[PDB]
């Protein structure tokens, strides 16, 4: 089988699927929805011509003459195996296309074994004889225009997609945009959808290492396709809401505990530009007490020792006296 590496594509994958010539288009490890918007490292194209009945053998986990002794696919195959009928073109008849039936062992996945070695199924060690019990392993396709269903010629091109092998230059179109840093954006940096802010990475990477797989198997390292710089992927800033309430018959005053984020980061870590105008009073406070589990915004710090009414994290309590955010006495 012929092998081609394809490196630079900016054009789309829309011609893959979406045509009636492509009759069989089962994609195992990827969806056809992902074809239009993806970005990958390497593209390999494998091409051969088979019969119609052995179309089902070219799959993960399938067996036969072709899948054992001619062409092997792995079980975790990411890509699309394509089959289409070619009855007019290859069948004139013509017997020039061959296949391998006899081999000593089954083939490894994506491994090519070209040989004209006589298979030893007989007692004698005969060499170079095309006769009885010296089996020549190559047999010919008997293609005629009188072929039945499953015995007509079919043409196959197999596309495989790879990760963490090459600098990513093979990926489809979006809106023409330039890079910004130090702000929270939907980055598509080598074309993957996600939200994060990237800095320059201090890691030294070999040039086959393009992406990264962490302990949760997400992308944590990435390299630019134009400049050969290295950057890491983390998402934007986090925080939480824990509301201080008395009973609703008493008062409608509240305060917010923020659970562990420093108070200069908490206007930035919340989406305060798109927030409700009530809550940004409760995000930037005049009396803000930083403690171990963050800081409480929307109440007043007093020093005086009161017994606890509302049990609140990191040694603070609240009481209705206005609501005071006091270090609790014990």
């Amino acid at each position: 089988w012929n092998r081609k590496r394809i490196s630079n594509c900016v054009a789309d994958y829309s011609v893959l699927y979406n045509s009636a010539s492509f009759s069989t288009f089962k994609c195992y490890g990827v969806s056809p929805t992902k074809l239009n918007d993806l970005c990958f490292t390497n593209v390999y194209a494998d091409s051969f011509v088979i019969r119609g009945d052995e179309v089902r053998q070219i799959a993960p986990g399938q067996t036969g003459k072709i899948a054992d002794y001619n062409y092997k696919l792995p079980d975790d195959f990411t890509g699309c195996v394509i089959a289409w009928n070619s009855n007019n073109l290859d069948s004139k008849g013509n017997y020039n296309y061959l296949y391998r039936l006899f081999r000593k062992s089954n083939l490894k996945p994506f491994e090519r074994d070209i040989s004209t070695e006589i298979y030893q199924a007989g007692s004698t060690p005969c060499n170079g004889v095309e006769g009885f019990n010296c089996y020549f392993p190559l047999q010919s396709y008997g293609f005629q225009p009188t072929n039945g269903v499953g015995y007509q010629p079919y043409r196959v091109v197999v596309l495989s997609f790879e990760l963490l092998h090459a600098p990513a230059t093979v990926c489809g179109p979006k809106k023409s945009t330039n890079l910004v840093k130090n702000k929270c954006v939907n980055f598509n940096f080598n074309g993957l959808t996600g939200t994060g802010v990237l800095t320059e990475s201090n890691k030294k990477f070999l040039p086959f290492q393009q992406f990264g797989r962490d302990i949760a198997d997400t992308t944590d390292a990435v390299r630019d396709p134009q400049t050969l710089e290295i950057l890491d992927i983390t998402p934007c800033s986090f925080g939480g809401v824990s509301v201080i309430t008395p009973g609703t018959n008493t008062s409608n005053q509240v305060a917010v505990l923020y659970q562990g984020v420093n108070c200069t980061e908490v206007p930035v870590a919340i989406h305060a530009d798109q927030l409700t105008p009530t809550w940004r009073v409760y995000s930037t406070g005049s009396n803000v007490f930083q403690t171990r589990a963050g800081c409480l915004i929307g109440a007043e710090h007093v020093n005086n020792s009161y017994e606890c009414d509302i049990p609140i994290g990191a040694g603070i309590c609240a009481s209705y006296q206005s609501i005071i955010a006091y270090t609790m006495s014990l």
Partner: antibody, heavy 120, light 111 residues
Framework: QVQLVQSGAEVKKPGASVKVSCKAS????????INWVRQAPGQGLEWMGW????????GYAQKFQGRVTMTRSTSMSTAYMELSSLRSEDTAVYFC?????????????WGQGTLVTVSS | SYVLTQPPSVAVAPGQTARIRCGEN??????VHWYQQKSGQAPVLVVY???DRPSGIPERFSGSNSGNTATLTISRVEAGDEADYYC?????????????FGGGTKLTVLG
């Protein structure tokens, strides 16, 4: 550092046979495939055949089958392309050229070459 | 029947660009390789793929494969570039696997 060392120069008579060798060291020789390329003075590089050392399977060019007796021995890690029945057009320099471990088979290391002379 | 065709010679000024091509019918469906042989020594590979280069040889040498051409580009031509260059398209060749070499380009510097 992968290096390929060939033998000394050859002086011959027509109709004889050669024992051109290419010794390799520092790397696992049996896993990696070896091609032989000849070059006459004034001509381009000409592919002669391909050889797998561990399996022993040899493929040859369409004009050169039968005449060419590419063999190997892993006891002393030396290949031997023993061409037979020498003729006057077979005067060239012989290069042992390894294809790559990766597929599509780029030639990555060569030898310095040895020169054969065919005259009466 | 597939045979590689290469032009005989090309001459450039030093410090300028050079255009050396090896292109035939449907060469874009196959892989192209490039090599450098100096006069009297062993050949060295300088381009590994359609565009990718190995180590040692800098970013002076670049190329691309599209359609019916595969053109090597040499930038800031120096004295050391005067050698022999060959394209090495692999082909199935009617199920007799061949390593087809080109006819050879001789690049000469001026001055």
């Amino acid at each position: 550092q992968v290096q390929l060392v060939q033998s000394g120069a050859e002086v011959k008579k027509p109709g004889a046979s050669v024992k051109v060798s290419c010794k390799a060291s520092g790397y696992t020789f049996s896993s990696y495939d070896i091609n032989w390329v000849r070059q006459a003075p004034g001509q381009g590089l000409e592919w002669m055949g391909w050889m797998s050392p561990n399996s022993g399977n040899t493929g040859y060019a369409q004009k050169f089958q039968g005449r060419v007796t590419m063999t190997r021995s892993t006891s002393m890690s030396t290949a031997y392309m023993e061409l037979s029945s020498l003729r006057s057009e077979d005067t060239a320099v012989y290069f042992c050229a390894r294809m790559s471990s990766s597929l599509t088979n780029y030639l990555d290391y060569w030898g310095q070459g040895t020169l054969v002379t065919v005259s009466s | 029947s597939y045979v590689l065709t290469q032009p005989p010679s090309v001459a450039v000024a030093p410090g300028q660009t050079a255009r050396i091509r090896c292109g035939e019918n449907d060469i874009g469906s196959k892989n192209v390789h490039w090599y450098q042989q100096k006069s009297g020594q062993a050949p060295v590979l300088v381009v590994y793929d359609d565009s990718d280069r190995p180590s040692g040889i800098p970013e002076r040498f670049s190329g691309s494969n599209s359609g019916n051409t595969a053109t090597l580009t040499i930038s800031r031509v120096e004295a050391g570039d005067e050698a022999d260059y060959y394209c090495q398209v692999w082909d199935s060749t009617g199920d007799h696997p061949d390593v087809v070499f080109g006819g050879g380009t001789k690049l000469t510097v001026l001055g």
